Symmetry: D3
Subunit: 153 residues, 6 copies
């Protein structure tokens, strides 16, 4: 049941100083950070990440948005991490996101792109692809978090 998912703390979150608060929500949930780094995504890498949206009217604005400032890419590991993180993120448009979710508590304002604080892989398949896009095997780790032993049988 243990999976890995990719999360991008977007430019709006970085600029607003919400990196720590976002990471804490994942740590408190029990999710493990197995990879993480601040990078500045260029257009080529951004378009590969968002290839599925190439023919949508908001594509250019989305690329402008994700490459606006540095972001923090990180890999989260844990039981059904993909669906769980998607649930924690909330509705794509923050105004529709439920209070308690990341977008629900932190997002609202938008530009020509729907600024929504973070990105979260939509599936195990997508996570695998996205993780490979931003990380090399040497940047991903296997280690114990404090409470890991508790769940072992």
């Amino acid at each position: 049941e243990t999976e890995r998912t990719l999360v991008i703390i977007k430019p709006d979150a970085v600029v607003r100083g919400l990196i720590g608060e976002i990471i804490s929500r994942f740590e408190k949930k029990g999710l493990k950070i197995v990879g993480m780094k601040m990078i500045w995504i260029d257009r080529e890498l951004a378009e590969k990440h968002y290839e599925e949206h190439r023919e949508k009217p908001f594509f250019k604005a989305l690329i402008d948005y994700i490459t606006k400032t540095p972001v923090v890419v990180m890999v989260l590991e844990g039981r059904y991490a993909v669906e769980v993180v998607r649930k924690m993120a909330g509705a794509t448009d923050p105004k529709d996101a439920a209070p308690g979710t990341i977008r629900g508590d932190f997002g609202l304002e938008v530009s020509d792109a729907i600024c929504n604080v973070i990105h979260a892989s939509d599936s195990k398949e997508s996570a695998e692809r996205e993780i490979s896009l931003f990380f090399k095997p040497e940047e991903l780790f296997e280690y114990p978090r404090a409470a890991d032993w508790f769940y072992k049988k």
Copy 2:
């Protein structure tokens, strides 16, 4: 899409020392406080604010409640602020409010009135009316919040 809505931090919240926590939820969401003040509402003003409930059995208790102690009236500005703040507030009766919402996390106990921490305009029309009831143009401001520039195109 930018709208203004009126919020009243009710007597139960003021007495319990929750003013700051409530305001923080709005600031963290990205909403801008364009007007705010602590006042003590008298019955005449209270009945005007709650005119729609004049013929309901709980009217008197509601007026007693909202005028029990000073309250904090404030105007919030932001993308679809009206519906967003209503969503953040949660169900009218706090016991039915979802965890994560203001009433869901802070409210429960009631008197002869359904004490529910805050008031939030139910529509743009109502917000306009309510704002005019408590504020003069000189008490409302237009200024930049830190991240405003980020969403400009």
Copy 3:
């Protein structure tokens, strides 16, 4: 409308140092702690508490889980406390629990038992039974919380 419900801060929560955070959610909601103590449940007491699950395949793992380390048993009092606390707890399996709920924000990983941070009585009847299992009348108290007077008529 005032009821009492039994809550058990389970071994996973105790080991992870979440006792305070869980208690705070109840206090902030307006619920009153009328009884509380850290104990180490033995198998006999555990099986009585979870008698309803005796013939389910996960029974043994559940008993192992609840008796793994000391736990904190506490009685919460307040308007419709039973249903309210159940709502605050969230879905039985933490991965399905909504952000904002206790299990939604704190739970995820499991062992051979569905580790889910806390236990909450499912009904007034069950609460009465469970409370009697862990507490004597001398361990339950009637006293005023700061804001009690506010709701009196």
Copy 4:
């Protein structure tokens, strides 16, 4: 008695950064009572009056520009030895020197031509009385019970 009233100004840097709520919560959690509060946009005349004791100082200009840059939140806090207490809670004037745990220590650092320091707190009972008058009319100050007031009755 020991009960005093002090004036706090949540300055433009705090308002802009969205820190109004966090600052207010610190005072509420301490047990201090908010007896008056409002968001206003201070004009040069009022700013100069509030900081009249510094009119003959080099940083005066930058200070006035700073305090009038955007709206602020002025408030009156009431409680046991409130003046000295809120001052202690505020921390050292220059936030870089303020201790972790204080408002300036946790929230302040960067400066402009003025030493941006999150909030203003009356320096003494005499200053508190003077400042409260500059920003509040008696009609805007209230006497009401906070939840735990009854607990401390002597």
Copy 5:
């Protein structure tokens, strides 16, 4: 070894104000282990025994009234130099003097006939041993692993 056990009492003012959880979280976050805990309503005899060293002091009466006003939460914290550490975390006896960041500094201020100060923390290992015995039976104290215990093995 350096591992000690100290007694903490979350006093009536904290219980009434709904601060039990916030106080406990501070100790948990520090790495201290709760080896015993329960809500009790202290009677005059027990209160006087706990504060016997102050029986010959003016404020004794108000103190007993205060500590027995409502139920309290007594707990035993275990950890490296726990006694001095919890004392440091508590802050100055009179909360108005306690530094921001400490429990009394962030949560205490108002007083009654007694100097209400949120919690009690054993003053020394000798006092800790005596106080733990007054409130807890060995059967109510436990030895178990906290999540990160394994990380510090020497």
Copy 6:
């Protein structure tokens, strides 16, 4: 100018305990800017280089074991007098002595053969320059605006 860059290492004890976010938030809330950051697993050679000034000290071995026990998060913080400020925020080297409000004061206590103290913070501008180079390539450090940067323009 007064703007400096310092190196912070969120040590294995903090990573294991799930405190990465809380630590980062303290720096963000202070107004400090994260110009570089990444999770890495320090090897003995790099650990020894970082702590070369302590290679001739008894606790050296335990220190290397500690800092390389699990992955860590290294980051560069930029801001007004960042070096001294982050040091102040960190608190006393031995967490038992660190004041409540500081990172070590609120989160640290227990130790192994090494004095586990949550994070590392450069001791001076000279050490900061040296340490930043050991962990980061110029290509991993960025220049960008944080939300309120415009507010402080002189």
